[PDB]
Symmetry: C3
């Protein structure tokens, strides 16, 4: 009895894992994941950078990071408003790095940006980055509230 | 063997619980759920009130109830068309209550509503409530078919 | 006692399997699945017929097939843009078959369709069926890229 039960239990668990993986694939598909491409998702909520980071982390994702034109376009299309990207220069002013470590290899800065502007009155300059409506980038205060767009691997 | 196998299964089960909780969180997020706020979902199907209640019940949710202007706005945004609300005066004519129990704490009745109208010919007056496109409320027959909008906890 | 722990673990597994079924029900609901009707879904990716077949298969579904006016509208609304239907006359020209087998029963052909055009510049004629934005059917090249829409049982 005991051993047959344990073997059935291993089989129940495995079937459950298989079904959940299928559920996850279907969910990604319905959320717009393109074959073999990393995908972006948003709840359309605006919040400070630290919150987006915390939120996406809780989802086992990361704050969206465009690595090329295609991805930048994908994020632009998903967000549809100013959205934080996983890029900051908090560690060393002027040096933008991915939250996932490493210096920028692809950029799409709007003209005259980044400018580490202080005029926002929120304190400090601008150490975070957002993708604005047309896909161009702007450095903004990490304390300002923008759309949360999380990224999941290909 | 046996006890080590059983101990691994506990770990396998626990890991599955966490993964499924993650899937639910991601699904809620993709469905527009805002942090710490209840969310509304619809499949855009129109059906009588009894059907909406059974449907939301099966999904472990409840028929959408606006507790304030914000939520009322969210529900109308989700439904897009006339939808039933979890409020009726079926227990005592004239006294609208939440299906979940209790008297109304917020209302957005359109002018000259509720009127417990009989002119619809479905029999009886009007004991159910629909939120019309412009966020306003109208009492309607529970037998009429309107959009099913379910609500899930904050 | 091992047996007792095993019993409790079996209970946990049952709770999890019901929880996953609920997750699947909620997702289908959020994606527009009507009660007792097939479920249609898309990731809004355009690709050749071969890829749509491959993708839907990986999800354990099939390329969307309208079998009546209702399903036709349902697919049209889901895809929003030209999508492939699981119908083709690849084998024998003029004999449209379902990817799931059998000769075409219900059809919603436009006037002058199917015409098996060749001048598209893709090689061959038109052996696939796309439900154009308007809802009507039009045969097209199975090499052209159209929206991927998969269906799942009622
Ligand atoms: C009109 O956009 C704003 O311009 C400022 C400069 O004046 C800063 O660059 C801000 O970051 C940017 O949001
Ligand atoms: C034109 O709207 C209808 O008006 C009736 C009164 O004439 C009732 O109030 C119905 O509930 C309402 O839907
Ligand atoms: O319109 C186009 O007409 C062609 C014939 O000229 C073919 O039917 C194509 O499939 C159709 O898209
Ligand atoms: Ca079994
Ligand atoms: Ca800076
Ligand atoms: Ca700036
Ligand atoms: Ca293992
Ligand atoms: Ca009444
Ligand atoms: Ca009325
Ligand atoms: Ca042919
Ligand atoms: Ca043909
Ligand atoms: Ca044609
Ligand atoms: Cl900052
Ligand atoms: Cl009624």
């Amino acid at each position: 009895a005991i051993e047959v039960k344990l073997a059935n239990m291993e089989a129940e668990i495995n079937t459950l894992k298989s079904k959940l993986e299928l559920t996850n694939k279907l969910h990604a598909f319905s959320m717009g994941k393109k074959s073999g491409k990393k995908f972006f998702v948003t709840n359309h909520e605006r919040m400070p950078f630290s919150k987006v980071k915390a939120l996406c982390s809780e989802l086992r994702g990361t704050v969206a990071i465009p690595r090329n034109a295609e991805e930048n376009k994908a994020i632009q299309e998903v967000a549809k408003t100013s959205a934080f990207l996983g890029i900051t220069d908090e560690v060393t002013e002027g040096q933008f790095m991915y939250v996932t470590g490493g210096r920028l290899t692809y950029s799409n800065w709007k003209k005259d940006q980044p400018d580490d502007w202080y005029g926002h009155g929120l304190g400090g300059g601008e150490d975070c980055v957002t993708i604005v409506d047309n896909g161009l980038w702007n450095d903004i205060s990490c304390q300002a509230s923008h759309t949360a767009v999380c990224e999941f691997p290909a």
